[PDB]
């Protein structure tokens, strides 16, 4: 029986959810495509159903969004920022139940579910002010009586494809900034977080309808692979923002490039921690634990590779092993719990395979490596030592709490080993040596977009620039 | 016999050119690939030869550039700007002979050849100041004792592929900004402007060498499609700037994306002029003429489509026919010619093809349309009427002076017609109606990246990589 | 008897007001200086009393604010922005009663009173985002291993002196931006809007107190010229923001400069409207009316001079006379009135003085010019013609609805006439001539800081101090 | 006899100088005011004469500058930047003789005279690019169909008053930026550097005349106090840039404020060096020597107060004393010399008085303190120890090489002592302690505008901003 039909989950109805939910919103709610059931990863029980977009739904929705844009693009940016402010306030009102739904359907602990909704709220609060800052300079022409104007306009329709692990806030960022920039949006979320997508869209739709705005400004088309591919290939989708796996993202980027569209790609990858000989272990161990096991190792920034100096290697591994043992585990929406399940059964399979492949490559499991004997998709947070830095399994990005630990002797080699990684998303170093930090942050250092040490024009990405020369 | 071997062309030696020139520079000059002879389009005589890059040349050069980068990236941005300043000074010193070479090998008139070198000089002067402005903010973190730093670093090696029609200044822009940003560069110019590429590289090389810097900071590998494709597929080329045809550019773009590299593409597109009923004809006619026939119609920005209201379509065409009659065509060194030869014999064939194809699709040639019976690649400035706004030949960007003219009734018509084209390059409107102007420049107006009205500073971030660095100083 | 003691005014207690209120806040409420009773200008009845700051109160408060700063300056800018966000939320919660108080004590109509509080709310919402944007660049030094950092720090204590006509939002802007910049503030509002200042401070104080922050971050010392002068001469007041009359502001400016402090002065100036011969009268007449009589002519931006071409001077005045006849004047709480009473009885006297003085200088009162025979400070919306553009009374900024009208022949005349005034505040032109518009907005046009055409993000740097920090990391 | 009449100084004629020089330039050269003779401080010999502006000259020049502005303001900013580029090139051509004149008339060593001309060249090279960056954004209005434009216009006439110690490059900065911003300028330099002012103005005037521009765009009115005061009180001088002493500058600022004008004031003051216990003395001593004795202690940034930790105090003083002894002294234009004379006889008097007052306040002269027995205005570079931090003589800014040395025990006190100074121009700390550097650079640290550790919108200052709201 569906969780939403059990009295103990009656709070779900506060988000306007029912047994079967419309998964298409374009000003009207509908869905003639396949009906999907999503499941709670903490107990593998069905929660509720969503009727996804058909091809026809997608086509209709794109057309309606583009018609809505004619109205929306004419609303001045600060007034669009006011609408985004109101979306923020509406999320505020629902933050506990929406955060609870994030934990229920996705599996991250309650403080993280609520925190993700809060992030979207904070983004909306930020966008309000940013909406008053959109514009380009009037530059002087070389010719007298001529004006040189850097003009910024909406791109039109921004399609947004998001992933399971941040099913609210990635959409939130894209939506908020695309909206103040005068674009309309079309959201396709992860199918396994469809209820979350629907719940967020219901909140936004009410704000739009209360303001007598066409709902298709924030359209929703729940669906699987065929909907995502359609967006990628659709010339009417002026900008496609994709967050997800590298394999899918690469193909999305190629499809967009083939039709001369624009894309924003967040593909994540491997994240490394490097603890040098002089690191403060009081920081390294709790940092590595949180970065490794937080959200059950399913973050884009999850630490999967830990490089430790030979001297402190064993102590750090020991203290990690001790730290891992005291990790509290349960239903993620129970305020007591610190560690929840993996998002799907498939991820549990990937976890087991990764552990096996790691052993078959020469690694020793010094902690965990097993599925937990309990309902749901729970696995033990795992530490593997003895692997070689060039190990194939280590370079692959399995969304599971497996920490691969590598030793090193000097700065030169470990820096080389890391710069040999391409997909690198973030690098976190722990050292007290200043010259070393500079080298790692500078031109010859990390290639990562995010670098951490011992721990503004974003709107232009959603607009198109023109140079306008005007003769008085 | 080679022009460079004739006494009257002895000035070419001021640019360090000889009968057979090395087309590879990486700190040393060389070239083991295929020879190419380039020709003067004014008389179709061979100028001199360049030995292009082999695969081994390319490999060695990419390696030397990346080694050079280790030194160059450590030189403070303002010191890099001083080098670029010296490059501008060195170009100044050679501006007349380098300008004359552009005219000799590529075929644009001398004021434009010199003017193109001057643009590169002005870019270097600009880059000097810009080099003191490169960096990102330190922002306060929400967490006490933490700092958020927006860090900008060089991408590494910037490959630069350029086209025949601006064989100096496009490279110049890319080179100057890439340099101050701490990158090293690798240039592959158009094969038919190989001498120009060598001459520019000789000028830059001497500045680098005089400053005791590794010359591969500004490397050159002359070649054709094979070198260009190698660069596009090469992971060591961190950023690839391409200027040229849409067909080639699209392939280059896909290859770079396949390896998750970075590209900057300039693929051009068509350029339209729209004269409304209330347009000042005093502006419309000369603006259209110069935009259409400047550089013999071989600019990226060349106007190839002129929409005129049914109202004044008849008159503007008549006034254009009379004005076109007075266009003087001739040798690029002649101070009294408006434009010179097409760049290639092939381009002349393309001109004749477009003219005939236009006729087959119902067009009337109301002026020009013929090849001039004289040595070189000279064609008449041409105007074609009666075509439909969707005629497949008018949307083809023929690099020749062919101006297609269309009539229209309403603003809604012509605006739809014009935004039916796939990402045109520039739109130039002539009107007095200020509401129409706000419309055309606004969100529901032209999709072109260049819009002009009554006429025919963060750029460095494109050449760098951003990181967000969070530092716990508590 | 005090309005606040009458049952129908019991809503004032929602703002924490009583019969006699403390006018000093520095974390605790107090006030040992002189009492002041403020009056409702709609009926000239006393509302309630405020005990103002003594010298001892001021001293203690400045000391407590500077002690509070030691804590506040260490709170990360985005965390400071979250406090300002909460202040905006707290204002929202009280917007109707706080708006009603602005209308009750100051006299502007309720939609403007509420609208003024809404502006402060919108400013707080804006400041939240701006707080994440505060900082300067790290630039590369010309010297290897050296870094150039543009560092921004709070100035310390920001004194804020505000005027009667916007007794909430001017303080709000200064307070919100000063706060996110890491400064503490000290407010001295207009004496005749003391209850408003106390009410706003009570709202902010609760947010600070609830957040366990020292309340003197947003201190209040109610007083008159003596407190204002103390702030101007006080070295501990690092930055003094003053809004008010030019005469007072100039003195304040000189006092601050004498001690090498920093000031921000808003001194207003006149506001002119220029309707040319080609002006759309459909715009001119209502724009002029609303600009002239909005808030009973008591805005800094109130239009007091209307220049009209000799061409249409006759008609626009006639159409204005008819429109003025339909202006409804009455109680600020009445939703169907365009404006209410003047702020003070003295202002009514000033109105009559200007009207008579105008007549003595040759002016014709073509509409209004009288005091309305009813309780409160009500005057008729007034239009005066026949004055010369240099008449000394028309250049006086009388805070009352008096509109002086002048005719002119040529553009050169009216532009000279208008830029003869000493730094006017705003210029609003109505014309179709686009060249005239470029002229008026350009280097040889208006010197006003506000220019409007066919209508009547680094700001945080003003509240901080910049340092260039060079660090040898080699 | 005048130096310019001696064959050995015939190189002066390369700058267009003669026995008596016109000190007014407004497109024509003139001067009906007082005739001044300037003197070489290395030998107290007269160099040449300059006929200064009368009141009438000043009045005429202001009017002509303002007429020239009508033409100049209509030249697009990048074309104005080209004129500034050409001024740069023209200085380049004269750099050796102009630098030599700086050494001759002002007294700073040759490398510094040439270096100051080079700074102006570099400023011109910078201004060329900056000229393409002048403008404000078009921001979105809250009202539909309305445009919000941040407009920047020239202020008009920028008066520039400069001092003896940087008689070329301060004017150069003001001139170059004011020019690209579309302003005309009026220069009044230090009377004791009048030949330098004339020589620079001749270089600029030729560039303007070659370009068929009205010379008054860069006007010159040489004069003393009455000319400076006239500029300060003149409503036609829209912006007054003053560099000089605090007493004069304060009065200039008050005069400008009285008439609601705009001013830019550079008043300099005291500069302190703080060497903590952990400082690298290998840096501290040569840094202190150069900052103290460079340009004979006549820089705006000259170090006059040295705070040293008790532990290293004596060693640093010793090594300074040893370093001071090997200082090479001679004619400043002789390429061999490292230390020249003070700029005037009056400064030598101030030097002697400061030394005497320092003794009478309790200080010990551990080196120097005497005038040198030789022609010119030469004094010994001086180190005074034993003074109290609150000493009156130490807080005063005498343009002479007197280094006052103070001891301290801990961070708290020395920071307090320094924050007790108001006029503080720069602060230079030497320490390896990171927390300490942060404290000194942060909100609770130095109040100085320039802070050194172990060693862009400038155009807006010369323009006026308006907010322009336009209804389509
Ligand atoms: O005009 P074009 O696009 O045919 O040429 C523009 C530039 O691209 C180069 N080029 C031609 N074919 C290429 C290819 N297949 N890949 C990369 N570059 C190529 C040319 O040599 C020229 O420099
Ligand atoms: O309109 P106004 O300028 O007379 O008043 C504006 C503000 O300045 C204050 N003020 C009045 N006299 C002052 C003075 N001498 N110094 C400083 N502030 C003063 C007022 O109290 C008010 O808050």
UniProtKB/Swiss-Prot annotation, chains B, C:
Domain of life: Eukaryota
UniProt keyword Transmembrane helix present: no
Tissues in which the protein is found: Abundant in hepatoma cells and fetal cochlea, ovary, eye, heart, adrenal gland, liver and kidney. Low levels present in adult peripheral blood leukocytes and fetal brain, thymus, spleen, skeletal muscle, lung and tongue.
Binding site for (S)-2-amino-6-oxohexanoate: 301
Consequence the record notes for mutating residue 397 to Q: In EPEO4; loss of alpha-AASA dehydrogenase activity
Site residues by UniProt (Transition state stabilizer): 165
GO biological process: one example: choline catabolic process
Keyword Nucleus: yes
Catalytic activity: nonanal + NAD(+) + H2O = nonanoate + NADH + 2 H(+); (S)-2-amino-6-oxohexanoate + NAD(+) + H2O = L-2-aminoadipate + NADH + 2 H(+); betaine aldehyde + NAD(+) + H2O = glycine betaine + NADH + 2 H(+); an aldehyde + NAD(+) + H2O = a carboxylate + NADH + 2 H(+)
GO molecular function: aldehyde dehydrogenase (NAD+) activity; betaine-aldehyde dehydrogenase (NAD+) activity; identical protein binding; L-aminoadipate-semialdehyde dehydrogenase activity
SUPFAM superfamilies attached to this UniProt entry: ALDH-like
Region forming the signal peptide: none
Keywords in alphabetical order: Acetylation, Cytoplasm, Disease variant, Epilepsy, Mitochondrion, NAD, Nucleus, Oxidoreductase, Transit peptide
CDD domains to which the protein is assigned, alphabetical: ALDH_F7_AASADH
Pathway assignment: Amine and polyamine biosynthesis; betaine biosynthesis via choline pathway; betaine from betaine aldehyde: step 1/1
Active site: 266 (proton acceptor), 300 (nucleophile)
Residues that coordinate or bind NAD(+): 162-164, 188, 228-229, 244-245, 266-267, 397
Family: Belongs to the aldehyde dehydrogenase family.
Disease linked to the protein: Epilepsy, early-onset, 4, vitamin B6-dependent: An autosomal recessive neurologic disorder ocharacterized by a combination of various seizure types. It usually occurs in the first hours of life and is unresponsive to standard anticonvulsants, responding only to immediate administration of pyridoxine hydrochloride.
Assembly and binders: Homotetramer.
Protein name: Alpha-aminoadipic semialdehyde dehydrogenase
